[PDB]
Amino acid sequence: GDVLIVGSGLVGRSWAMLFASGGFRVKLYDIEPRQITGALENIRKEMKSLQQSGSLKGSLSAEEQLSLISSCTNLAEAVEGVVHIQECVPENLDLKRKIFAQLDSIVDDRVVLSSSSSCLLPSKLFTGLAHVKQCIVAHPVNPPYYIPLVELVPHPETSPATVDRTHALMRKIGQSPVRVLKEIDGFVLNRLQYAIISEAWRLVEEGIVSPSDLDLVMSDGLGMRYAFIGPLETMHLNAEGMLSYCDRYSEGMKRVLKSFGSIPEFSGATVEKVNQAMCKKVPADPEHLAARREWRDECLKRLAKLKRQM
Template sequence: MSETTPIRRVAVIGAGTIGASWAAYFLSRGLEVVASDPSPGAPDMIRRMIDSAWPVLQRLGATEDADPARWRFEPDPVRAVEGAQFVQESAPERYEVKQALLPRIAAVLPEEVVIASSSSGLLISRLSEGCRFPGRCLIGHPFNPPHLVPLVEVVGGPGASRAAVDAAMGFYRAIGKHPIEIRKEVPGHLANRLQAALWREAVHLVAEGVASVADVDAAISEGPGLRWALMGPHATFHLAGGEGGMAHFMHHLLPAMQGWWATLGNPDVTPALQQQLIAGVRAELDGKSVAELAQRRDAFLTALLELRRRT
């Protein structure tokens, strides 16, 4: 893929929650989208996602040439990728589904067209098996919802070409995303592993009776989570080191933290503990529906992103 040939047409293969959100975002950046999904209800889902997301995307800086109607639906994924300059695959998170799908679309695409999978944790070295030009297949994992959250994890894996990784990083960056390159293939990539580590300790603290589910959640949302919206853990601890920065943190605070590491838990999530967590979340949310929570989350993310643009 040449940097002198800007991408104008993207194929979105798999148009569930993630794929439809990707489609809305691509449209907001002035791109043409061809979407494909085996579900007969997919076109309506895409249309609803675009309609609901468009006002927010305009607030967050849709390009002047953005057109919410510049998309079409093609049920056959092979036909959908014809003429595409970039493919964002968002099929169900199962090896057997993606391993059957990717070789079909790879077979008809030129070598320079990147195929990026939205997989949240699968290994691209396995997903690309049987693909024509497997070196152009990689992970392009967004965070939910993709039309709002800037992060995209790009994982090339051991067989990826440098040109494909650079092309994907450049494309995501050009459309306003914040891509990060995961340099070594590991299950769950990077951000989900960090989430998993934090949740493991959160579950352990509930299981040990240290705090309620609601208080464990509040310990993040009313505390360090607010700081994490601005900077990550390393930069946060650099700031905690005062004028001495990370060097001072290492000298004065690292020993205590290493002592805590030794006591971190690895809980056995038994059926009884699962029910305790479920009941705790229900009590914490006090009857709020998933739709209500998602609406609140998206409104908060929109306001936060607007604030970040001004600072």
């Protein structure tokens, strides 16, 4: 009934805090001990920060949650009595395959072997493993403590039970899992994100709007509805139902989409134009980027709270 996190980087530390908030004993493993020590320190500091701002998840005190998180340096002993293993190493296929092969030789048939991968496909990650039926990608969105989405992507041989158990586990810790029925490049979130970026890029390239104003169209406009309702339900409510929306605007949608240009090269003059505008707002140095990310994360923290209330 315990949880094992392989890799004590940012993504791993975030998972540790999420599972502990759900009352699960968490084992934090990493090949570098110096990194596990740092992880426990970081986790303690963040837990304290959340406590002081009344932003802790669940009903357990910060102290109790912290006591549930421990370090282990022995993988064989790390998988003992564990029901879910979340792999959190770099986005390097060779490395992930090595770790899953190592886990494959020591785990039982119950435990779920889950990867945090944001891009690697299950077929490339798990094919050939004896425990492939227990394998799955459970991709979180940074920052996971505030953004609940978890994309569950299965391998063609992943069992329904593996998906169901993981969906239930993610819901149990307060996250919002979704079932990506078939693996696909970019899963779902990045495909939608890239669709937006592609058109945004061309609008800037064509001189329709400045990069800064384009972003405002989203942050002070379309994006506000999307923080609460998806694109389909949005259509449903902006007319007398989905059928009504398609009846009223399908002609216009097809007309506009037909006018879309080609796939961007994401370079040259336009990248320089977009970059210059982005840097004017946020200098591209470690300090300014970190400060802006801090602001962004605070907004998300407050939004998550508001979402839960509504």
